[PDB]
Write a protein that binds this ligand. Structure first.
Ligand SMILES: Nc1ncnc2c1ncn2[C@@H]1O[C@H](CSCC[C@H](N)C(=O)O)[C@@H](O)[C@H]1O
Ligand SMILES: Cc1cn([C@H]2C[C@H](O)[C@@H](COP(=O)(O)OP(=O)(O)O)O2)c(=O)[nH]c1=O
Ligand SMILES: [Zn+2]
Length: 405
């Protein structure tokens, strides 16, 4: 049995996705076929209800000099983070000399707006190649992990932060207690720690098991985040559901008692309770539906091949490593994957070794079908790929069900 990373409680497994590769490792075709693998399985703590993986991948295996995800590759996300930055400039960052720290700034998708407002800030970005892209934009960035000690160092030299923000980062960090002790050291007494990450309620409702992989250690809910804050000196004082990345919640933590929670917190807590979101039976039902999607997806991809139809994929997502490796889906069924990220092109996907080609290569003559791994970006991708569909090309989705359209 594994100990909960939040409270030390016991974690009960409910889904085992088997042996998996690093999701963001893209190999050159000529590289030795040797990969780090680990067991990906997910459990729920008995005491605090935190849904979490049962085996940690060490941070430095995932995040380092060549980490390939470039946030600013999606226009929807550029706009989503610009808007969030302007909202913070209008509310939490209005004093004399405000200071915002972002955990996991990546290429500077959010902090660019803060920098262009002349607000003092610092991005933590331990993946140095994307850090350098943020620094090219004028952003102040430290190429370190946020944790207790690096938070203390920033408090020492920069003073308190009015906002600490983390998007698609806190749930990557098993050492969430260290991060919380760092937020406690660094946050102003009237500041907020705000984070947004894939939401358990969405994962369960959409059976989007691809949101489960090495970099998503936690699948947060309002119930577990409320517990986590409380256990650590903070309080959950707002929630906002976001449509990005398949469904997220943005959580606002304050020092306990310093602000009164919005009605939104209790409403979401009560909906989670009402729908038995984190009950083990629900979480098992979700696991059973994950297997049903596997079996339906592979039967379709097999039938397409038997009927002489070409199939490729669209989006070399981190997410897709779970799909191809759990389902057994390799270049015999999905010939290539198209992606706009230069450092993933002319590479093979992890585990399954499907070749990745630039999206500019997805063009007449089109394949019959494209398996949409970037299904959280459907609207943005399809708007750019209307010629494909007008030609008769069709999308295969596996969220929330296997279907073609
Ligand atoms: N302890 C830590 N502190 C700060 N950044 C971290 C971290 N562990 C991982 N990261 C960074 O967290 C990032 C997660 S990817 C998400 C990036 C971006 N905020 C977005 O929403 O698109 C990677 O860039 C990774 O290097
Ligand atoms: C929005 C968009 C993304 N992509 C690619 C870039 C990324 O490698 C991938 C989308 O990944 P994303 O869904 O953002 O994250 P993850 O890697 O966590 O699953 O799809 C395109 O090729 N075209 C596009 O229009
Ligand atoms: Zn716990």
């Amino acid at each position: 049995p594994t100990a909960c990373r939040v409270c030390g409680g016991g974690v009960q497994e409910f889904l085992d996705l088997g042996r998996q590769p690093l999701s963001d490792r893209f190999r050159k075709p000529d590289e030795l076929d040797d990969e780090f693998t680990y067991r990906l399985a997910v459990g729920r703590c008995d005491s605090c209800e935190m849904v979490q993986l049962t085996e940690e991948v060490p941070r430095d295996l995932m995040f380092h000099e060549v980490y390939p995800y470039h946030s600013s590759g999606s226009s929807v996300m550029r706009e989503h983070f610009a808007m969030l930055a302007r909202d913070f400039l209008a509310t939490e960052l209005t004093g004399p000399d405000p200071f915002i720290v972002e955990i996991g700034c990546n290429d500077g998708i959010m902090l660019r707006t803060i920098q262009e407002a002349g607000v003092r800030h610092l991005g933590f970005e331990p993946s140095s190649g994307v850090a350098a892209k943020a620094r090219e934009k004028g952003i102040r960035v430290r190429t370190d992990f946020f944790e207790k000690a690096t938070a203390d160092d920033v408090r020492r030299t920069e003073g308190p932060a009015n906002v600490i923000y983390a998007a698609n980062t806190l749930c990557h960090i098993p050492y969430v207690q260290s991060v919380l002790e760092g937020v406690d050291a660094l946050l102003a007494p009237d500041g907020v720690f705000v984070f947004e990450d894939p939401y358990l309620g969405d994962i369960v409702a959409k059976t989007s098991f691809d949101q489960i992989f090495d970099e998503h250690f936690f699948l947060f809910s309002a119930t577990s985040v409320q517990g986590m804050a409380q256990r650590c000196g903070f309080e959950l004082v707002d929630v906002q559901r976001l449509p990005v990345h398949g469904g997220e919640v943005r959580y606002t933590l304050a020092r306990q008692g310093s602000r009164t929670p919005s009605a939104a917190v209790a409403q979401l807590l009560a909906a989670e309770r009402e729908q038995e979101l984190s009950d083990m039976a629900t979480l098992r039902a979700f696991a059973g539906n994950v297997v049903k999607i596997r079996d339906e997806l592979t039967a379709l991809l097999h039938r397409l091949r038997a009927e002489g139809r070409s199939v490729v994929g669209y989006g070399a997502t981190a997410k897709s490593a779970t799909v191809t490796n759990f389902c057994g889906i390799g270049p015999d069924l999905v010939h290539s994957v198209y992606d706009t990220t230069p450092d993933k092109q002319n590479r093979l996907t992890p585990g399954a070794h499907i070749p990745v080609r630039p999206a500019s290569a997805f063009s007449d003559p089109y394949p019959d079908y494209a398996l949409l791994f970037a299904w959280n970006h459907a609207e943005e991708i399809m708007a750019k790929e209307q010629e494909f569909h007008q030609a008769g090309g069709r999308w295969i989705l596996y969220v929330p069900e296997v279907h073609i359209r």
